[PDB]
Structure 1
Amino acid sequence: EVQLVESGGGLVQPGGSLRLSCAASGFNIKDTYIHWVRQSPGKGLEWVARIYPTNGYTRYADSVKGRFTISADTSKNTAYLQMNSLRAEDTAIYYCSRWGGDGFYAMDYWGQGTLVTVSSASTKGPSVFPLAPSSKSTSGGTAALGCLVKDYFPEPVTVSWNSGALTSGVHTFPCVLQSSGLYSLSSVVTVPSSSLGTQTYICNVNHKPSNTKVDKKVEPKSC
């Protein structure tokens, strides 16, 4: 299986520096081109740089030349992007991809992407509050419950239910940016009304930028 895995994305101040890695497996980067491509609200999908690790030839987008450098270590089957003099407009998901692998003249494998946030704001971990099921969240014999993940920065935060075992009926809403500059989101799940009180429901929240991991049990309220 061909795989590319980016790492190193995170919050960085304007003018600061960050280094991304792209670990390849299932093929040798000596046989392909390796590209970095980013994706942002402002510019969409935007090619950043490429390298041919066999001969070290590199090319760069005009908007990053001099500030970013691409490189590869064939002995670790890994490519890198050094990012200096960072600007707000560099905020993006950074993907690495291969081109020419198996003779296919397109980017046929892309990593999951790593988010880079260029901002002067500080990291903040979220508060996790239950959205308890009640007489106001049930109808037709099913009930909705959830978790409110409030006031964090930067993205990303992840939410699962019952350690990933509960996936059916889950809606994890897209994050919203509050006027405070902090993000918030809710995750809800619909379940049988008859399971409330017998089946445990826990939302597993992870905000890696703050090393915040919260497992919150959600149950009906007392009275």
Structure 2
Amino acid sequence: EVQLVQSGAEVKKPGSSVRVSCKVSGYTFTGYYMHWVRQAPGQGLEWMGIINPSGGSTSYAQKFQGRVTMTRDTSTSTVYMELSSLRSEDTAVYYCATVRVGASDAFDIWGQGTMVTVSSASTKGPSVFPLAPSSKSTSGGTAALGCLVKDYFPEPVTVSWNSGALTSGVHTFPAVLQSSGLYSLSSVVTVPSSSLGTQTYICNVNHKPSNTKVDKKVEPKS
């Protein structure tokens, strides 16, 4: 098997540059040339350009013409991809893909992709506000409680209930991206309301890039 492994996700701010590597494994790298592909969120594939591992000449698309730099390193069997004058509309997953001289014309092997979030917001930790369940619910049935993870701009925030002991009823929803370039999500557990004061519900909102470790309890409404 001939694999294409790409660099991990990068977080840039508008007006910068970003380099994305895409390593080929195994054979004499300069055998069959490979290309690059952008894919903005939800939207479709977009071709960006070509580089020939051997004859290092490049050939780009017109949209990214002049603002994209493609290089290759014969020693370590890789190709590189540089966007110049980074703009907010360039937030996408950037794939690489090889076409083999002969069979045929399509990209048989693809890379894993590299998410490149591009926004002006700064690395911030989120504020947590407890969300109380149904006020009455004394003789009701089942209710929902949760934690609000508001305002942060790196999107790996991890929420877990009571050090992981709580599992049944948990549904941590995908984060929203508010218009200010900042994130917010919610995590909610569904439990029988007969236990609205005899077991403890505490969520641990961890945010690693700011190392903000904040606990926040959710007691019944008062």
Q: TM-score, normalised by structure 2?
A: 0.68
Q: Equivalent residue of 1:148, what SS?
A: strand
| Pair 1:213 & 2:208 matched | no
Cα distance in 1 for partners of 2:108, 2:202 equals 41
The corresponding residue for 1:4 is 5
**Structure 2 counterparts to residues 1-223 of structure 1, below 5 A:** 2-7=3-8, 9-14=10-15, 16-25=16-25, 29-40=29-40, 44-100=44-100, 105-117=106-118, 119=119, 121-129=120-128, 131=130, 134=133, 144-153=144-153, 155-159=154-158, 161=160, 170-190=170-190, 202-203=203-204, 205-206=206-207, 211-217=209-215, 219-221=217-219
Q: Is there any run of 5+ residues in structure 2 with no aligned partner, and where?
A: none
* 8 A contact 1:133–1:219 mirrored in 2: no
Quote how far apart the aligned CAs of 1:125 are.
Answer: 0.9
Quote how far apart the aligned CAs of 1:150 are.
Answer: 1.3
Q: TM-score, normalised by structure 1?
A: 0.68
The alignment of Structure 1 onto Structure 2 pairs a total of residues equal to 215
Matched-pair identity in %: 43
For residues 42 and 145 of structure 1, do their structure 2 counterparts lie closer, same or farther at Cα, with a shift above 3 Å needed? closer
Cα distance in 2 for partners of 1:26, 1:216 equals 46
For residues 214 and 171 of structure 1, do their structure 2 counterparts lie closer, same or farther at Cα, with a shift above 3 Å needed? farther
For residues 33 and 179 of structure 1, do their structure 2 counterparts lie closer, same or farther at Cα, with a shift above 3 Å needed? same
Structure with the higher fraction of residues in strand conformation = 1
- The one-letter code of the counterpart of 2:149 is V
Q: Equivalent residue of 1:187, what SS?
A: strand
Cα distance in 2 for partners of 1:164, 1:73 equals 45
Cα distance in 1 for partners of 2:77, 2:111 equals 15
Deviations 1:24-74 (A, max 9, x none): 557775454333211225963211122231332422111112211111223
Cα distance in 2 for partners of 1:70, 1:146 equals 47
Cα distance in 2 for partners of 1:218, 1:87 equals 37
State which structure, 1 or 2, has the greater radius of gyration over its C-alpha atoms. Answer: 2
* 8 A contact 1:127–1:150 mirrored in 2: yes
